[PDB]
């Protein structure tokens, strides 16, 4: 259905077995995204901290 894919498509062994990939145009890795750690509400008895 398409002649070429130009996208953030990761070079993987299972894909390379059925399609061709150029050498990498971008280096990367899996990472963790978290919601930021906002400031906590001061707890009762936080005067002992």
């Amino acid at each position: 259905k398409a002649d070429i894919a130009i996208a953030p498509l990761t070079i993987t062994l299972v894909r390379e077995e059925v399609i061709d990939f150029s050498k990498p145009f971008m280096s990367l890795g899996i990472s963790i995204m978290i919601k930021k750690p906002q400031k906590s509400k001061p707890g009762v008895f936080s005067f002992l901290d």
Partner: peptide, 29 residues
Amino acid sequence: KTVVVTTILESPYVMMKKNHEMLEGNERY
């Protein structure tokens, strides 16, 4: 003749231009 490129709407690699409805073909992205 014209190469059909498959791609994905994934920011910031490919995004719809703010005025894409007024543009044609490759100029929409």
